[PDB]
Amino acid sequence: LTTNEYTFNPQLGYISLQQRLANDEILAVAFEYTVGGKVYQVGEFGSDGVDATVVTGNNSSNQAIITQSLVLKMLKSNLTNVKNPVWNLMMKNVYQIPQAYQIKQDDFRLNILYTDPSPINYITPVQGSSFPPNPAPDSKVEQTPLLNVFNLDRLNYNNDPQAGGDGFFDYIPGVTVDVQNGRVIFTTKEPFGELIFNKLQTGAGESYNDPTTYNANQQKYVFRNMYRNTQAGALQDSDKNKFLLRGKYKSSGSNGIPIGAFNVPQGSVVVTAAGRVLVEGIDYSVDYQLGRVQILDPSLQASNTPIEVSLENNSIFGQQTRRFMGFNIEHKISDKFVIGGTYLKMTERPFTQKSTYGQESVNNTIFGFNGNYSTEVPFLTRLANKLPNIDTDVPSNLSIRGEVAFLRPDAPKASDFQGEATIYVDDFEGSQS
Amino acid sequence: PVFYSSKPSGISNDDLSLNTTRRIYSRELYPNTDIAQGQIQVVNTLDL
Amino acid sequence: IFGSNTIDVKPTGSVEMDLGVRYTKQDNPAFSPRNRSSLTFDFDQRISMSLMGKIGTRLEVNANYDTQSTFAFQNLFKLAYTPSEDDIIQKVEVGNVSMPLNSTLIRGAQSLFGVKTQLQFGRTTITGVFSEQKSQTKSVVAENGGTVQNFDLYALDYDNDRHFFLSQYFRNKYDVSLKNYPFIDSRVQITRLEVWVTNKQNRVTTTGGGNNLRNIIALQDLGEAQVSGVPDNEVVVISSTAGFFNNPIDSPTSNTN
Amino acid sequence: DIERPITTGVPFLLVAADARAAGLGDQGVATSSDVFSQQWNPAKYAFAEDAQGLSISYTPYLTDLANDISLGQVTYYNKINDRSAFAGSFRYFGFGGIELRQTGDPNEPTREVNPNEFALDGSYSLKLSETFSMAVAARYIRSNLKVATEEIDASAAGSFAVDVAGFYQSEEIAYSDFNGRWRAGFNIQNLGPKISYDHDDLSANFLPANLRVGGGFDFIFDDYNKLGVSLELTKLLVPTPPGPGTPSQSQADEANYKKYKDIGWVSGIFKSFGDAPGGFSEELKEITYSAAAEYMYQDAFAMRLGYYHESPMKGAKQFFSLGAGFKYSMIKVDVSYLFSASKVKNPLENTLRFSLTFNFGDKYETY
Amino acid sequence: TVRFGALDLVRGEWRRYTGTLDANDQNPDDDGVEFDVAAVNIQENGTKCPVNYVMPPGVQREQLYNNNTVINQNEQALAVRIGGAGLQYQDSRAVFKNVSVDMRQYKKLKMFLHAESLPNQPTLEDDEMVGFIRFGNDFTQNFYQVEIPLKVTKTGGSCSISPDLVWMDDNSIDLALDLLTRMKIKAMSIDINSSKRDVNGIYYPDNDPDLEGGDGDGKLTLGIKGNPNFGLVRNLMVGVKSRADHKDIKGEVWFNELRLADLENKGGMAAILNVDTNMADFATVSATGRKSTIGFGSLEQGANERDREDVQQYNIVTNLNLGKLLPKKWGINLPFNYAIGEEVITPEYDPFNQDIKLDQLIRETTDQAEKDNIRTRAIDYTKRKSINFIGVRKDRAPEQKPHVYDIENFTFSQSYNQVERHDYEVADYEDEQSNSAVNYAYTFQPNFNYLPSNISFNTNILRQSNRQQFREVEVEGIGLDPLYRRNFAFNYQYGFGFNLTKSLKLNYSATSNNIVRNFLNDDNSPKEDFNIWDDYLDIGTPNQHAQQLVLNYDIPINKIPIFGFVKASYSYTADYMWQRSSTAFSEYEDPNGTVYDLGNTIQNSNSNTLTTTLNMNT
Amino acid sequence: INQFRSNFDYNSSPKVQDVNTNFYNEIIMSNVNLVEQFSPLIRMDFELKSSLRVLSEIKKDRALSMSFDNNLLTEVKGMEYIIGLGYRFKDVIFIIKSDINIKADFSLRNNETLVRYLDYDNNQLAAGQNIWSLKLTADYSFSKNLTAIFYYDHSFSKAVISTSFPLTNIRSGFTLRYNF
Amino acid sequence: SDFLVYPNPTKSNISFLFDNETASVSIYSLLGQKLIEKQITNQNPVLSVEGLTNGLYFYTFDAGSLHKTGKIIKQ
Numbered sequence A: 001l002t003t004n005e006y007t008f009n010p011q012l013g014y015i016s017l018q019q020r021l022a023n024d025e026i027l028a029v030a031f032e033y034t035v036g037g038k039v040y041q042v043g044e045f046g047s048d049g050v051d052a053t054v055v056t057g058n059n060s061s062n063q064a065i066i067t068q069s070l071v072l073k074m075l076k077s078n079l080t081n082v083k084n085p086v087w088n089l090m091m092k093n094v095y096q097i098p099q100a101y102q103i104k105q106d107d108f109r110l111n112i113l114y115t116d117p118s119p120i121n122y123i124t125p126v127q128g129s130s131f132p133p134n135p136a137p138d139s140k141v142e143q144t145p146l147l148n149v150f151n152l153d154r155l156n157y158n159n160d161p162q163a164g165g166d167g168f169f170d171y172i173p174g175v176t177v178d179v180q181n182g183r184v185i186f187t188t189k190e191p192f193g194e195l196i197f198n199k200l201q202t203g204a205g206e207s208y209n210d211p212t213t214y215n216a217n218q219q220k221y222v223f224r225n226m227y228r229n230t231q232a233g234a235l236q237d238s239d240k241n242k243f244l245l246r247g248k249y250k251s252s253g254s255n256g257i258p259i260g261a262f263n264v265p266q267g268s269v270v271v272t273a274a275g276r277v278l279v280e281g282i283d284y285s286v287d288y289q290l291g292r293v294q295i296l297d298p299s300l301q302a303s304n305t306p307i308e309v310s311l312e313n314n315s316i317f318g319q320q321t322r323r324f325m326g327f328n329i330e331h332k333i334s335d336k337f338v339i340g341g342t343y344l345k346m347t348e349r350p351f352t353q354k355s356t357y358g359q360e361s362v363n364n365t366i367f368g369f370n371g372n373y374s375t376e377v378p379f380l381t382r383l384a385n386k387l388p389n390i391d392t393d394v395p396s397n398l399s400i401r402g403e404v405a406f407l408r409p410d411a412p413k414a415s416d417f418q419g420e421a422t423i424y425v426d427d428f429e430g431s432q433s
Numbered sequence B: 001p002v003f004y005s006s007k008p009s010g011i012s013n014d015d016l017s018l019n020t021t022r023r024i025y026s027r028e029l030y031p032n033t034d035i036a037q038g039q040i041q042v043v044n045t046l047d048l
Numbered sequence C: 001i002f003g004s005n006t007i008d009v010k011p012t013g014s015v016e017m018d019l020g021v022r023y024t025k026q027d028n029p030a031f032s033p034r035n036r037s038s039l040t041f042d043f044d045q046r047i048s049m050s051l052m053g054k055i056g057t058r059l060e061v062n063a064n065y066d067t068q069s070t071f072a073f074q075n076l077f078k079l080a081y082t083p084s085e086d087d088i089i090q091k092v093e094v095g096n097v098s099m100p101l102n103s104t105l106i107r108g109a110q111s112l113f114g115v116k117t118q119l120q121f122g123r124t125t126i127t128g129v130f131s132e133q134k135s136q137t138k139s140v141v142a143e144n145g146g147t148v149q150n151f152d153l154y155a156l157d158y159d160n161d162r163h164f165f166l167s168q169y170f171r172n173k174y175d176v177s178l179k180n181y182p183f184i185d186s187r188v189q190i191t192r193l194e195v196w197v198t199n200k201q202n203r204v205t206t207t208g209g210g211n212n213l214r215n216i217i218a219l220q221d222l223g224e225a226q227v228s229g230v231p232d233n234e235v236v237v238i239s240s241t242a243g244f245f246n247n248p249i250d251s252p253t254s255n256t257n
Numbered sequence D: 001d002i003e004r005p006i007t008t009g010v011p012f013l014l015v016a017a018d019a020r021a022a023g024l025g026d027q028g029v030a031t032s033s034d035v036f037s038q039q040w041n042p043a044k045y046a047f048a049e050d051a052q053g054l055s056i057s058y059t060p061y062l063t064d065l066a067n068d069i070s071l072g073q074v075t076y077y078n079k080i081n082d083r084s085a086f087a088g089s090f091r092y093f094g095f096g097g098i099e100l101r102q103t104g105d106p107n108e109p110t111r112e113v114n115p116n117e118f119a120l121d122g123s124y125s126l127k128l129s130e131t132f133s134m135a136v137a138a139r140y141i142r143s144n145l146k147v148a149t150e151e152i153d154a155s156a157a158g159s160f161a162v163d164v165a166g167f168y169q170s171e172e173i174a175y176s177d178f179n180g181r182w183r184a185g186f187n188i189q190n191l192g193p194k195i196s197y198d199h200d201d202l203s204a205n206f207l208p209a210n211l212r213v214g215g216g217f218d219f220i221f222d223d224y225n226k227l228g229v230s231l232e233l234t235k236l237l238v239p240t241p242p243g244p245g246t247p248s249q250s251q252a253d254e255a256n257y258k259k260y261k262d263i264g265w266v267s268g269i270f271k272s273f274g275d276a277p278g279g280f281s282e283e284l285k286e287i288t289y290s291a292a293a294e295y296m297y298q299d300a301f302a303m304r305l306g307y308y309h310e311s312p313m314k315g316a317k318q319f320f321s322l323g324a325g326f327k328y329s330m331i332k333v334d335v336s337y338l339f340s341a342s343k344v345k346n347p348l349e350n351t352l353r354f355s356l357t358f359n360f361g362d363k364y365e366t367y
Numbered sequence E: 001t002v003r004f005g006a007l008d009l010v011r012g013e014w015r016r017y018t019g020t021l022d023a024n025d026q027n028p029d030d031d032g033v034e035f036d037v038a039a040v041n042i043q044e045n046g047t048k049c050p051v052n053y054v055m056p057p058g059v060q061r062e063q064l065y066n067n068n069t070v071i072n073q074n075e076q077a078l079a080v081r082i083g084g085a086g087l088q089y090q091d092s093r094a095v096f097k098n099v100s101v102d103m104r105q106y107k108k109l110k111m112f113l114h115a116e117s118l119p120n121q122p123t124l125e126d127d128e129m130v131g132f133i134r135f136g137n138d139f140t141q142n143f144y145q146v147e148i149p150l151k152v153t154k155t156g157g158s159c160s161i162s163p164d165l166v167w168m169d170d171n172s173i174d175l176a177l178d179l180l181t182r183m184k185i186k187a188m189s190i191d192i193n194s195s196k197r198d199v200n201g202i203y204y205p206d207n208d209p210d211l212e213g214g215d216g217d218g219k220l221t222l223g224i225k226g227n228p229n230f231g232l233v234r235n236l237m238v239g240v241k242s243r244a245d246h247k248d249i250k251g252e253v254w255f256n257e258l259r260l261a262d263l264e265n266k267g268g269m270a271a272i273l274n275v276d277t278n279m280a281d282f283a284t285v286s287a288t289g290r291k292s293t294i295g296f297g298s299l300e301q302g303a304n305e306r307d308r309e310d311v312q313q314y315n316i317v318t319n320l321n322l323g324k325l326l327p328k329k330w331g332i333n334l335p336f337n338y339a340i341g342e343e344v345i346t347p348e349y350d351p352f353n354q355d356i357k358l359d360q361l362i363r364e365t366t367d368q369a370e371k372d373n374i375r376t377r378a379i380d381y382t383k384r385k386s387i388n389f390i391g392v393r394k395d396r397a398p399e400q401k402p403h404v405y406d407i408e409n410f411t412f413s414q415s416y417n418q419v420e421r422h423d424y425e426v427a428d429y430e431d432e433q434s435n436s437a438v439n440y441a442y443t444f445q446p447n448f449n450y451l452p453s454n455i456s457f458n459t460n461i462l463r464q465s466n467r468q469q470f471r472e473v474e475v476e477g478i479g480l481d482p483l484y485r486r487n488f489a490f491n492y493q494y495g496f497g498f499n500l501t502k503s504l505k506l507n508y509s510a511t512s513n514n515i516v517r518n519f520l521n522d523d524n525s526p527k528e529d530f531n532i533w534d535d536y537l538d539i540g541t542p543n544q545h546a547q548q549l550v551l552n553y554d555i556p557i558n559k560i561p562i563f564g565f566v567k568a569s570y571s572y573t574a575d576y577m578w579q580r581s582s583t584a585f586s587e588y589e590d591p592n593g594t595v596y597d598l599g600n601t602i603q604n605s606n607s608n609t610l611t612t613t614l615n616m617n618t
Numbered sequence F: 001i002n003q004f005r006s007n008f009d010y011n012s013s014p015k016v017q018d019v020n021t022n023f024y025n026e027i028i029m030s031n032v033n034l035v036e037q038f039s040p041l042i043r044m045d046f047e048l049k050s051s052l053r054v055l056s057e058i059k060k061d062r063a064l065s066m067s068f069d070n071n072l073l074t075e076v077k078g079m080e081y082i083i084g085l086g087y088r089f090k091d092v093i094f095i096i097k098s099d100i101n102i103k104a105d106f107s108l109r110n111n112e113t114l115v116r117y118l119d120y121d122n123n124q125l126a127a128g129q130n131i132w133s134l135k136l137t138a139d140y141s142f143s144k145n146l147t148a149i150f151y152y153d154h155s156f157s158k159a160v161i162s163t164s165f166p167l168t169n170i171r172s173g174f175t176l177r178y179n180f
Numbered sequence G: 001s002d003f004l005v006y007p008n009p010t011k012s013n014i015s016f017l018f019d020n021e022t023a024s025v026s027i028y029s030l031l032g033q034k035l036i037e038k039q040i041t042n043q044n045p046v047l048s049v050e051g052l053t054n055g056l057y058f059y060t061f062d063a064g065s066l067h068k069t070g071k072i073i074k075q
């Protein structure tokens, strides 16, 4: 492999390939490392190994060819055996953040939750028993956040150690995080196995490698079979996969918010800062061709407020045909008073009479009454003129915009089985490839 | 397919009707399956 | 019904029409003799025209048909019939109509294809539309610059078959060496590393870092010494370890172990 | 839904290639004399106003996914006398081009495969009377929708077809409020031997033999405003496969299918009427229809609405059509859009069909 | 001669569950039960020997258009074959599937089941094999189980049976999920070791003498194990159980069309009120008030995308030009932005149990303390408050001479954002941020010159203070220990550009970042009541310091009238960086107890460059 | 040299020979590359007075790569002949008169990848390519708007190793372009 | 190396050579839409069509703004 087909951790001693080896591919290594002044080598390199071929003879009639092999160390075997130590060399504590590329601190939050059935930031003992008494300060499980339980939070923002941590994932770009590939590495090789087993251990009579001796608290939280067995083989143990790594990461790259579409329709972008709709000419600007939204409001840029940007992108392929119909009344009560009665109906036409889960069709209706009232108030202008050093003549304005909307949803009659809106959890046609 | 489409030399129509040399159509093996017009209509069985 | 009889709809752009024969012949013996050659008719069009104009000073026509991109937001067609202001009907639009609604709760669709009509009863403005929508609504959340992406992995969904410890020594040293991170309690500094995989590509090239292809005998117990808290059979596959090791128990991984 | 539809080869012959007819609800058998009038009714080429004309039509397929799949058409008509005309069309349905390769170098030789299907037809139309004309068309159909691999042959399947058409256009008849004009037309299409995709005697598919009968009327206001209302009925002249059976269990199904498939096209034309347990009222369901209205202003702007309906139990292709046509100097541009109304996904939805016709030569009067 | 018309390796989406389903045997890899899972479709298995496969009554083949053709898509069902020695009395065999199904917007869960005897085997009798679904978080600790005794399709004569005799209505599962909710609420009071639970730990309301009417379904048997959630079904399993006491049953069971029906189409309401006023270009007040009910949403949102929560929010934003309160002769640009707001979100479904509506759970609790706990842990409250003094500067006079000591060069920016939240996770989450910045930028305008061309210097005091206390979702009496994150930092960068000669050009810059660490005790234990404004103008110990120097020289050798052609151009970029090691290094404590200083890091960099033209002409 | 390293075995220890009985080297590498490129070897570009412009260029390339892991010489050779002819026939009569622009592009790319063993005669042909091509195109303006182009592409790709198959491609026909 | 699909008539995966920006490939494959929707990255471009069926499939590779479509062949 070339140096661009893998990376490795020079201190912790593990390689990370650029391509997954999910088949009979064999992985073999030869490495040389240093411990202070000592140098150790574990395989045969091309430089110091035997020559590839030794030839004994003059012409092709009497020549003898001897092709020799390099002796390397096996990391992945040809035939998968989980009862072998070579199985243990694969790291099962690295989690790829989905589609993350260059995760940076202050733009990355991680948390560990126990979903059973709701996301909970801690662990309760099995009823009828309790967690081990008088734990070490690093072995606290009772009333302890799960980042502290799995040793992913023991440092403050500046990576200095703190007593109970700061409640945030410890972002160390060489120990717990892989910046260039967006991977999170745990500080233990089996975090949901031997680590939480040791946290919950009530005595020396329980051994991690003998699941018959667990103390009814390890029988619930210790996910041993995800480390002793393949992922497909660990799907059998259904009651253990309850720990959820939930988080967010912020991708900016360039200056502006990438709305995820290009050549968006004019006026199709709506930006809301904190429940209020910004003005497209004042608080932000839109570059439609590049699909960028730049926030021009000084107080909003440095505000940490989550800005929601909604856009109608027409670069879609495969979406069902959407029938949009409806009307809009614009009664004008006076020269400064408007009443509207918008009614809209959006139906979808499914490709098939059967709708699978996720690919659901909508037959929604939304109707609303709105009212706008804009006036000039010279009283405010005169009051401002009463201020010490203000004598401007620009008129003051007031504007009240109310709106009420009702949404009556439905499902299209096309996707109805025996007269009722139907969604197929499994029609059993997608199996058996 | 050259045996059935453009019959070669030394092959008769009796050689192509044996249930071991004859042509299999999908309408025989899959009578309920609908096949688009102009696509493959025959089953290319693997003979041993 | 129209202001005048003048029809000056000017077209612009280009049209291409290629007609010919495409002959192909691949000398693959595995093919049937009926597949000796493929002589097909190759016909293609590149209609790349636009059409702008006014009809009777009441119809405005604006169309752009270009068969060289995604038609959902490139192939445009707009008919606008605008009677006199005295009439009830103010505008009838056919084609790429728009439905801009100045309401926060109820959002209209900007990209539609259909009929849009507008009536004005003195003070009441009734705008009706019936169309098909060519776009999809998409929402993003941005905090301090760029967008925010959430992720929800589970315990089992780890990254497999990609990350490998280089030895049982490193595997059993990992936890203890990361006890007081960010300080790593390990003086190991891996200087050189070469990795060999199964070669299925069999593609020889001078630009892919040379052409190195060696016979490989990868051993499992190579460079293996014992471990303190780990039994030998969890470190080596050899049936008998009697007379196998020739170094102290906690020795670092090396060929001589 | 659809129960036992008729299985006919080369179905792309039944797809409207021109934007005018596709905007009139896929019917042109009785409309005004048109350059595109080769697929629908060649017999009105004798009534064309211009001496000769060329036409290029484009119908994209699956526009959202791929920009390659399409149905193009090139038509050329030329009337020599005032009684006759020669026409020739070339319809080509193509997937574009698949550039198949098996290596990674960006310069190794790639093999292009373009599975296509084209019909090249030529017709002669003679105006027997002053209001009635006939036409005979010969068509060659070739299908190359297969990709050559191992143990599969991609030889193109060919066939021939004969079309007989007739078109009657009455003189301008005045009425109480307007001076209208009557038109009628019939067309029997794709009368030819079975097309064999496997190049074998046993496995052959019928040609999509078609029968169109249509009639239309023109309301004329001020001699420069026209409103043409047309109505067309269409029927397939291919026997329908039997359903449950007309005697274990698979024995009856196989016997009925074999009996149906051992029927010649010449006999199949006569056998089309009936062959069902239902009566004449149920038999009449086999006819599809389409009604259209086209408004013409100054003979240079046209706005067309159309509605095409098939039977619920076969085909199930019902839709509305909008169309617009503009004439600048000698180039007529037509655009057509389709609003589906059937429970099955029409591949022509969200698709704007385009047509561009040039007309040149001397101007012939119309009776 | 053997002609393989088709030869494939077939892989399925439903995995056989290799593990016990009854707590008595515990070794399912025994009993000699040949348990197969396959699929029967109308394209291939339309001629099966026991029963020809036919679509269930009302099901139709999907029709698609590929190329001007109508293609009837395949119709398939999942077949499960139990043969060999047959099931034990209570042993069960099942196939599972990992999914993500939210079935809270649909009222009914329906399925078609078919049972038949194996050929050449003893006939399976009615109400012996039980077809069951089991869905939830897992298959052993948290699930709903819906069982139905199967009526065996009578065979023996013709293999082609009418679909209403293959897919009988007595075997179709039609389960209302509100029955599951009622069963869950009833089982909330059942102990985990109660006698009402069976050996497997499942609670069947039918087998409970104290419960009237059973589980409310006369055809189905319902059971619940461990507080599952059908608002997110992560695991779905279908299988067959046995009911024959002294018998081992063999048979084939088809499952088809597992669907959700009877959508809840009750709508929603929303209202918005925006009052926006401006006052003589001096004041601007914009108050927005929004209030939405459960089930509201947009047109494009489906069943699971609409709002399952009542939202009630407001937001008042005020802008003042305080600089206009002062005379314009000495212009002051002092904008003041004050934006307050808050939202309250009451969920439709209780955050605990995730699938019982909050009102229904509140009614069926009969415990005032617990009712208050539920109603309080449900609500999601958020309050934001922002104050901004960004861009404070004195505007230059129209006729004013630029000067180095002029105050018009400075610029001030203050920001203070506070967020107070509390929801199902955080009992009280506080986040205060203060950011004060002072910028300076002067540009000079017209042995060697020692007058810099431009000088820049900008400072920043960035303080972040998050307090995050998670809740005990059991009782609102204690809670968890609050977690404090503090990022008190003092950054400052500066630089200047000299043009010592017409050729030389020297650009220097230095950026430093210190961290304020006065909020900690003698140990590494953060203090609780340390305000963010406590010791503001504090410069902490340095944390990072970077220097950069850029020299550009043209080497005026052209003045020498021997080398008038040389165009030498030298460039020298020097960089330095000092980075403070974390306290894990500076105060490392070896296992012998000795404390070692492992020191910081220093980095260096040069960028020498020499571009010469050396024109040999002249 | 893409990557040279210092040898940890080149030290002061009395062990000075490896398993191959070779002295340890101070600097060790795996590959060295000699890349020669005539781009172009020649380019005769000349326009005649009859508007017949000719652009005939020959390019050559060698990519010797010596690998010390297996001590093999991977040699990549490339040759490319290119000919471009351009003519303008003046006033060709079909009653309609205009100029015919003839453009011919001939090409021939040879490519080889051998692996040479030093110890004996085992020259392996690892890869190859042999593709010649010819694109003729004649443009003729029937009017100010309508133009017609006659195009003819002919490509033949031989097999250097057996894993590749000879491929003949011949596109031909007409192209009518109309502008408004 | 602009954009390649190396094995077009494949009984196996797709190798999908392209630029750095990641991909959003999808498959519809003869009729309507049957989205596969993998998440090809810059240096791990391997698909999975080996199991679905045999036919001429439609793919829409998405490198951000680089929406390149085409047809693959399942042998």
Ligand SMILES: CCCCCCCCCCC(CCCCCCCCCC)(CO[C@H]1O[C@@H](CO)[C@H](O[C@@H]2O[C@@H](CO)[C@H](O)[C@@H](O)[C@@H]2O)[C@@H](O)[C@@H]1O)CO[C@H]1O[C@@H](CO)[C@H](O[C@@H]2O[C@@H](CO)[C@H](O)[C@@H](O)[C@@H]2O)[C@@H](O)[C@H]1O
Binding pocket: C015, C016, C017, D052, D054, D056, D076, D078, D330, D358, D360, D361, F096, F142, F143, F144, F145, F146, F176, F177, F178
């Ligand atoms: C089987 C297929 C036949 C195809 C016929 C093609 C004829 C091409 C000739 C261009 C043309 C037709 C418009 C074609 C537009 C289609 C473009 C296609 C685009 C595809 C995507 C433009 O004519 C128009 O265009 C104007 C250009 O601006 C012309 O201006 C002027 O145009 C030029 C003065 O003529 C000036 O040079 C130009 O300076 C001016 O400006 C005008 O004359 C006119 O409006 C003129 O047609 C003329 O050519 C003759 C040939 O001998 C044709 O005779 C026919 O020949 C056989 C049939 O070929 C038949 O057997 C035969 O019976 C019949 O006598 C007639 O038709 C004739 O009228």
